[PDB]
Amino acid sequence: RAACGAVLLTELLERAAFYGITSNLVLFLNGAPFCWEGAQASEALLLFMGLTYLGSPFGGWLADARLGRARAILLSLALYLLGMLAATFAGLVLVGLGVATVKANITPFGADQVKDRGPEATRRFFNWFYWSINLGAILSLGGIAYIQQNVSFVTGYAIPTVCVGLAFVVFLCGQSVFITKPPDGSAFTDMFKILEKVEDVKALVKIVPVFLALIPYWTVYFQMQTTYVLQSLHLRIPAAWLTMFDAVLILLLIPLKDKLVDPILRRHGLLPSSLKRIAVGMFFVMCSAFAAGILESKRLNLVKEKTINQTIGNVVYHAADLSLWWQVPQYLLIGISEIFASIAGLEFAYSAAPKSMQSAIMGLFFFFSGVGSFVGSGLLALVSIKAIGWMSSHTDFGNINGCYLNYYFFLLAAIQGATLLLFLIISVKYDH
């Protein structure tokens, strides 16, 4: 239909711009634009990310009553372009709000273009949606690297600006064929305060427990991502490309997963719902945490005998004799888990959402994921205390050797176990 293609393309540019912003924010804010403190840039980026996570439910509400699911995205992209065409705190707030609204509004609108075909069509569209997001991240990183290398640094913001602008142009061009739904609502507040609209309230209350189950999984996922990024510099490597291993792996795996799982699972006749797929993803996170803990424990045991100097980046991280390739099973497990879990959870959040406020539900889901990321950061901060020990190295970039991480990984695995059991209980209660 090419409408899903245009939606995917717009998501590609939006994700590319957002990932470029997140990667290069602190480097740009190193001190040239009157922010000359590492903590001041760190809190600026943290505030930007927190507002991005917080504004998604509000972006969904704005697309519930005032505007539809197309005018809202167009206005969000206009705000995006204005922000990248811009004291700076107001601009950062504008950019964060635009990102939140566009992220919370594209996905349900994208699934709406194909919903009539069938539930399997929605699953295929969401698979390709996540694939497009990851390809956008990879392309953004490669493009900014190529531009900063071949061309001078004067065009640093140029790539995000052209990405956002091109997204606006393709969205405007596609609007002529896109399928749109008129907005309605603002008549549900009195329904859940007394204790089709009644069944809507029942669906709304039944949705929440699965999100309360999913949030600690989000904390574990974000903490695991950060710890893997921080660990890969301490293994013998034969800038910031170490955070794209998962992206490359899932980019290579998603088409293979589709063509080599869905036809056979459909053929076998035992194709499960989304909750089972989320449970499988959490089980693979379990296995990933166990494998990472084992690998890091062996690396620390080898470090205790001798160390090897490394000079990756501007820091002088001291590495071990283990090659970086030894982390391939870890990232393979985490990629399989991501494919089986994130896509399934997104599909369930879209499908089980009320037929009239899908955008609000998806925004709430994204806000819950962000709150989980914050909870995981708080857990990392709590663990670093001297009363319990474990991680005891922050400095400017840290030195993990001589500091415990195996117990941290196994704590992550145990938290994942508790969450998996609790989510299994809620899934049984939901589908029974």
Side-chain angles (χ1 to χ4, degrees), residues 225-257:
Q225 250 185 26
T226 285
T227 320
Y228 291 167
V229 153
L230 169 163
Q231 159 148 255
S232 266
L233 320 91
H234 294 83
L235 306 152
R236 261 296 313 261
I237 300 127
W241 310 278
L242 303 176
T243 181
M244 301 325 198
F245 280 69
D246 163 50
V248 168
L249 201 36
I250 178 189
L251 212 165
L252 283 184
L253 206 59
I254 273 183
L256 165 156
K257 168 254 161 160

Side-chain angles (χ1 to χ4, degrees), residues 25 39-53 92 374 377:
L25 185 53
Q40 284 279 323
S42 211
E43 56 199 287
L45 178 126
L46 198 185
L47 163 154
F48 165 64
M49 226 65 53
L51 166 88
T52 279
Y53 291 138
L92 278 201
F374 282 154
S377 190

Side-chain angles (χ1 to χ4, degrees), residues 20 24 139-149 155-157 159-160:
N24 304 16
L139 154 77
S140 158
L141 175 125
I144 178 64
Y146 169 76
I147 284 303
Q148 76 95 17
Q149 215 32 43
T155 86
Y157 44 100
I159 276 287

Side-chain angles (χ1 to χ4, degrees), residues 55-90:
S56 271
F58 293 359
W61 152 244
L62 172 149
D64 166 342
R66 271 215 49 85
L67 330 168
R69 231 184 324 277
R71 341 279 284 180
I73 315 196
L74 259 180
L75 181 96
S76 199
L77 281 201
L79 291 196
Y80 219 144
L81 215 35
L82 202 138
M84 266 45 40
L85 278 204
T88 167
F89 266 49

Side-chain angles (χ1 to χ4, degrees), residues 177-336:
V177 52
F178 280 37
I179 296 311
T180 41
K181 211 172 71 69
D184 193 18
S186 79
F188 27 75
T189 302
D190 77 326
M191 264 308 149
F192 33 68
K193 298 292 164 25
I194 306 180
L195 193 126
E196 161 156 10
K197 20 169 190 167
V198 193
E199 321 305 349
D200 214 19
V201 162
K202 324 292 191 203
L204 191 36
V205 47
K206 274 292 151 83
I207 285 284
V208 154
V210 317
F211 293 165
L212 323 162
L214 266 171
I215 164 176
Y217 154 69
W218 286 119
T219 89
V220 157
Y221 180 44
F222 279 88
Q223 268 313 308
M224 219 150 56
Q225 250 185 26
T226 285
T227 320
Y228 291 167
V229 153
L230 169 163
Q231 159 148 255
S232 266
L233 320 91
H234 294 83
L235 306 152
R236 261 296 313 261
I237 300 127
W241 310 278
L242 303 176
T243 181
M244 301 325 198
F245 280 69
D246 163 50
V248 168
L249 201 36
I250 178 189
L251 212 165
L252 283 184
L253 206 59
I254 273 183
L256 165 156
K257 168 254 161 160
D258 195 10
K259 287 273 209 165
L260 271 283
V261 172
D262 314 48
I264 315 108
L265 251 169
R266 164 191 180 172
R267 174 51 196 74
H268 224 306
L270 285 162
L271 160 72
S273 41
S274 37
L275 286 319
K276 285 209 169 183
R277 306 184 123 223
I278 301 166
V280 170
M282 298 200 234
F283 184 37
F284 274 75
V285 155
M286 212 76 97
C287 294
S288 147
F290 174 110
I294 282 297
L295 167 38
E296 160 262 3
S297 152
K298 288 322 142 183
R299 174 204 66 103
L300 170 61
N301 172 40
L302 199 31
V303 154
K304 193 89 136 46
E305 268 64 75
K306 210 162 49 83
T307 42
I308 291 94
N309 167 43
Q310 197 170 248
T311 48
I312 175 64
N314 253 23
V315 178
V316 198
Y317 313 96
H318 289 77
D321 255 340
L322 300 324
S323 306
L324 177 59
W325 257 32
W326 253 120
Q327 262 273 330
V328 77
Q330 187 28 228
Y331 277 122
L332 209 184
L333 278 182
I334 204 175
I336 293 194

